[PDB]
C-alpha cells in the first residue's frame, strides 16, 4: 500500500540502526571486526520488498549510525559495502523464482561472497587503516575469514528460523 511499506522500511532501518549499538568484537586479536545483528532486518526487508530495498536500509542504517557514531568513516563504509552485498545477492536468489530452496541457496552464497568480498577489501584497506605493511593483513587474515563467515552465517540461519517460524 506504498505508504504502508515505506514506513515499514523506515522503522526497520531504524530498528537495525539501534541493534548496531550492541556491537562487540568477538575476536580479541582482530578487535576492529565487530558483530551486530543489524543485517537481519535488512535480510527480511530484502526478502519481502526486494533486493534494492534491502540494500537501501543498510545504506540509511549506517548513515544514521555514522551520524551518531561520527568517528568510524572507514569501519562503517566497510560494513555498508559488505552489508549491501549480502542482502542484495541473497534477495536476488530468492527473487525471480520464490522458493524455500532458493532462500537457503542464496544465504549460503551471500555468506560466501561477502566473506570473499571482505578479504579482498581488507587486503588493500587494513594496510592503510593501520598505516602498516601488507604482512599485518596476513596476520589478520584468518580472523577476517572466520568473522564474516560467522557473522553472515549467523545472520543467515537466524533469519531462516524466523522465515520458517511462520
Ligand atoms: C578495517 C575494518 C575491517 C572490517 N572488516 C569487516 C569484515 O570483514 N566483515 C564485516 O562484516 N565487517 C567488517 N568491518 C565492520 C565493522 O564491524 C564496522 O565497520 C564497525 O562499525 C567498525 O567501526 C570492518 C571494519 C574495519 C574498520
Ligand atoms: C513482517 C514479518 C517479519 C517477521 C517478524 C520478525 C521481526 C524482527 C526479526 O528478528 C529479530 O529482529 C531483532 C531486531 O533487529 C533482532 O534483535 C533479533 O536478533 C531478531 O531475532
Ligand atoms: C618484503 C619487502 C617489501 C614488500 C612488503 C609487502 C607490501 C607492504 C607495503 O608497505 C607499505 O608500508 C606503508 C607504511 O609502512 C603502509 O602505509 C602501506 O599501506 C604499505 O603499502
Curated annotation (Swiss-Prot):
One MF annotation (Gene Ontology) recorded for this entry: riboflavin transmembrane transporter activity
Sequence intervals crossing the membrane: 8-28, 40-60, 74-94, 108-128, 143-163
Gene Ontology process terms (BP): riboflavin transport
Function recorded in the entry: Substrate-binding (S) component of an energy-coupling factor (ECF) ABC-transporter complex. Mediates riboflavin uptake, may also transport FMN and roseoflavin. Probably a riboflavin-binding protein that interacts with the energy-coupling factor (ECF) ABC-transporter complex. Unlike classic ABC transporters this ECF transporter provides the energy necessary to transport a number of different substrates. The substrates themselves are bound by transmembrane, not extracytoplasmic soluble proteins.
Protein name as annotated: Riboflavin transporter RibU
Keyword tags: Cell inner membrane, Cell membrane, Membrane, Transmembrane, Transmembrane helix, Transport
Quaternary context: Forms a stable energy-coupling factor (ECF) transporter complex composed of 2 membrane-embedded substrate-binding proteins (S component, RibU, BioY), 2 ATP-binding proteins (A component) and 2 transmembrane proteins (T component) upon coexpression in E.coli. A stable subcomplex with both A and T components are also isolated. This complex interacts with at least 2 substrate-specific components, BioY and RibU.
Localization annotation: Cell inner membrane
Species, as recorded: Thermotoga maritima (strain ATCC 43589 / DSM 3109 / JCM 10099 / NBRC 100826 / MSB8)
Any one annotated GO CC term: plasma membrane
Membrane topology: Multi-pass membrane protein
Superkingdom assignment: Bacteria
Major location (coarse): membrane
GN (gene name): ribU
PANTHER family, per database record: RIBOFLAVIN TRANSPORTER RIBU
A matching Pfam family: ECF_trnsprt
Family named by the database record: Belongs to the prokaryotic riboflavin transporter (P-RFT) (TC 2.A.87) family.
